[PDB]
Amino acid sequence: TKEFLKIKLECSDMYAQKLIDEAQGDENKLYDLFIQKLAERHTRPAIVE
Amino acid sequence: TKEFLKIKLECSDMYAQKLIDEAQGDENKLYDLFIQKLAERHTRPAIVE
Amino acid sequence: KEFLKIKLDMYAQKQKLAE
Amino acid sequence: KEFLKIKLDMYAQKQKLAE
Amino acid sequence: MIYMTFGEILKKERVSWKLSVKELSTLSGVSQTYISKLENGKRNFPSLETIFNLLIGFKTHIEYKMGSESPFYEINNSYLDEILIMFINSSNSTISDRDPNELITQFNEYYDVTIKKKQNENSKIESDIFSNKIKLVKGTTKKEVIEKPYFDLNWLLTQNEYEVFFDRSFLLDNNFLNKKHFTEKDMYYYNVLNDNDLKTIKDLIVVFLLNKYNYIKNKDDFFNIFTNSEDDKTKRDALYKILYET
Amino acid sequence: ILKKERVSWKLSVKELSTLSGVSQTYITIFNLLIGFKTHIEYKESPFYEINNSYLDEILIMSNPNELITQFNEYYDVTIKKKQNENSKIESDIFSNKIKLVKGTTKKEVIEKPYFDLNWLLTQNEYEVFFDRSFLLDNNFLNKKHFTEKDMYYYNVLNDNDLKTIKDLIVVFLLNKYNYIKNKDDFFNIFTNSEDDKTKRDALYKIL
Amino acid sequence: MIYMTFGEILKKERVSWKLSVKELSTLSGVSQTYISKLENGKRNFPSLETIFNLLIGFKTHIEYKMGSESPFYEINNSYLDEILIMFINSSNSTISDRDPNELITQFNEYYDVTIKKKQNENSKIESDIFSNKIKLVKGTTKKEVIEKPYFDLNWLLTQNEYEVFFDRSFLLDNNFLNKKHFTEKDMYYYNVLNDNDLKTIKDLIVVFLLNKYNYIKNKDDFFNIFTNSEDDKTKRDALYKILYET
Amino acid sequence: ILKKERVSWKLSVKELSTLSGVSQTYITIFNLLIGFKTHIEYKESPFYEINNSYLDEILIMSNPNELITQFNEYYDVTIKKKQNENSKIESDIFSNKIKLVKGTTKKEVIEKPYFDLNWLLTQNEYEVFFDRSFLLDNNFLNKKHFTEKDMYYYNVLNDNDLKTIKDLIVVFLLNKYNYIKNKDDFFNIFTNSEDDKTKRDALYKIL
């Protein structure tokens, strides 16, 4: 939950909490927000030689 | 106004009206929406030789 | 010593890997 | 007819534009 | 006042979106010949199913242009509903029940049973679709099953079976013009891309695509999930897992 | 079978059938040698100097200038005979409406030039797919409701991408090789019967 | 219970964001030496201005990571406010007035007067900024004015004044190894990119960038508008015109 | 002034000052000729065959084997004399911590290798800008409130772009030229005093 947000988004636990506390109750709103920032972080590592 | 939406976004006048009628009153909401779709359409023409 | 026939009968029999 | 000195005294005096 | 006939409204909306007859024909269940007629007035005001087919044609084209994303999905609907109301309150309209909300609800019903059928038929050539063994008409869902995947920019760049040509213009693949002797049908086909070039190109494309768009590890799981009939909210939740690992 | 160089170049019974003769019956003789002439050439200042001489050895190859001026005559007959069969479809060959098999001048003309990269990118008739490994939706995360185009054809390249790809490819090609302004003139100046050294100094000027 | 000192909270938040001391030093008005001390406890609980400087350091780093876009702009604030409340209710805290809403409002006031000053100083080297005659520290706004624009990937690819090197690895620019004779300091510098290559690269970059990001016709008008102190809503409205022609 | 080939190659008084001699005083003699030796070479099988012979004419050029074996000796002195001054900074020259002026082996070593493309893209110390013609914000339209980074440095390339650029550049370079695995070995095998034909057959093996 909180610890998954922490690792994935690369924020702090305190910041993960404030991230939950806003759009709180609405699991789907918090989920949509989560997935939004998670799609920004692209597969920048490509098959280099 | 309507005719600027028509030309820029490349929709019909009827569709330009429905585009205004939703998020109506709020000039800024309608404006933000307008500008959103307008940024999608990129400078795909590049300096070819 | 057949170091070309494996690296690239005819051709062997007689800038190829510089590409 | 000095068709190289303008296309590219010394060099003129004696695959350059194929690049 | 002077109020337009169904045919005059069909043309007005059709030309507003810069559609030709063939274009709207291909988008709709309606034949090139019958559309033209309905716009003239040589055939009489049509069945409610053809009005619905025609509106599907419009739907799967305004979505292609304006987008089917959250805000424009609604705006696309309210517009299609408005066009539907108009054909119903036409001057030469033969529709008895002139109730907006019913006819809207009928049209939505008709799309749901229509897409269920169009899904079920796609599920029969599922492999041919996924493997991209389909000729697909730009700006349409209208598909034709083919021998190979000829319209897959990757499959072309991949296969070494056939020689892949470039427009006879930046076509000097003989970078070494040291050859004073010219080969049998070498100057005939001097455009073909060498397996180096053809995969130098694939690289450049994927490096670019990797930067812009999401990569899909589970090509098959993703496709299976997306394509199967299931509550769109259940579906998108399921698709987001696959992609972003959640 | 003779000296089986088929295997020493990695060929087959369905590959030589298309190249020359064979006809799905591996075991006339003059004809089959053609199916290895251009193969060394595909697979220059110092090369062509010793490429011919490589297959010249095989001419000699139980069961000189003998065949150097006898078989080499049969070459010039069958290449100008097919080149008169190629002049009957020259429009198809310039437009690129042709299936040219890899290192193989065996042909079959087709309605639209499917195997032209620059055609596929610069055409507005048919959708162009890519791998099923790329989600090319862009507004995917803002689509609470999905269409058939979304579901089955999330893998379609859009115009803005098709143009960016074409412009990368030609920016690349412009660096290595040179551009041919007179597309038709360059093509016709070589598809003629005239000698290799004739057009050699003529084509250079165009460049 | 056992409650952490200011120093122990500073460290907790600082290491949570994987910041070093130098990193937080450079982000804040605070010296590398004084931060370390405040985390130890060798110097006493600090002034409200250093707490504010430190929080600015955090602000111009959470914004660098999480983003300063609409949803995360608020979440970034509520977080900075929360960190601010904590330093105030520290075990070794010497702050008399323990009012949340005042101290928040003070911190926001302190950023507004701070940014006004940081704008006014940027306006003095305006040309040096715009012309990219600045050394800028990754993940920071901390700028150092320099002789040229050395950290402008375009300016490097443009100038023919100096030879532009590539890592000594894909460094075989002598594609023609026909040369049996090797030149004076030719094998020394065999990495340098030729003016062809260096502008084949610029092309590839801009074609890519043109596809992803908005082009700006009025480089100067855009910059003048953005950089000048003006109601952000008035500003963004003004910037959107310039870009999209409205 | 003599035969003013300075102008026939388009040079200047601040260009030859850096190349050799001049010293902001255009009008010793042996030294200045060096400032045109590598210039023909920068601006192969058939070339170098007639490149030397081009400047050999100028040796002759009022106010043979005379200077062909006398000035050409002064070349081998001053190039191994500076190459012993270059061995005193060879680490700087391998790391690329050097301002090499265009077609000019005049140098000045610098703290960080600023003029290395592959360094600039693959370094995490300093922000990398581009033209002021590109808005590289991506979430620009969703920013109702702007920071200082937004306002003054909307033109900063982000990591995801810096990596995509580097990977385009090397995908490109890999096509034209060949990769050198032994970066240090290849560099040291050429920076030595040994003869051009010595290492000729040695370097090829590495490839």
Author numbering:
A (entry chain E), B (entry chain E): 3 to 51
C (entry chain D), D (entry chain D): 4 to 11, 15 to 20, 38 to 42
E (entry chain A), G (entry chain A): -2 to 243
F (entry chain B), H (entry chain B): 6 to 32, 47 to 62, 66 to 83, 88 to 89, 97 to 240
Please give the exact wording used by the authors of the publication that reports this structure.
Normally, these elements reside passively integrated in host bacterial chromosomes under the control of a master repressor protein, Stl (SaPI transcription leftward). Instead, SaPI activation depends on the formation of a complex between Stl and specific phage proteins, which act as inducers of the SaPI life cycle.
The SEC-MALS results were confirmed by the X-ray crystallographic structure of the Sri-StlSaPI1 complex, which was determined to 2.9 Å resolution by single-wavelength anomalous dispersion (SAD) using the diffraction of a selenomethionine-substituted derivative crystal. In correlation with the low occupancy of the second Sri molecule, two regions of StlSaPI1 subunit B (residues 32–47 and 83–97), which mediate interactions with the inducer in subunit A and connect the DBD and the central part of the protein, present high flexibility that also prevents their tracing. When complexed with StlSaPI1, Sri is inserted in the StlSaPI1 tetramer, interacting with 3 of the 4 StlSaPI1 subunits and burying ∼1550 Å2 of its surface, which corresponds to ∼33% of the Sri molecular surface. Each Sri molecule mainly interacts with the StlSaPI1 DBD of one subunit by using helices α2 and α3 to contact StlSaPI1 helices α1, α4 and α5. In addition, the Sri α3 helix interacts with the C-terminal α10 helix of the symmetrically related subunit (A*) in the StlSaPI1 tetramer; and its extended C-terminal tail is positioned over two α8 helices (subunits A* and B), which nucleates StlSaPI1 tetramerization by interactions with subunit B.
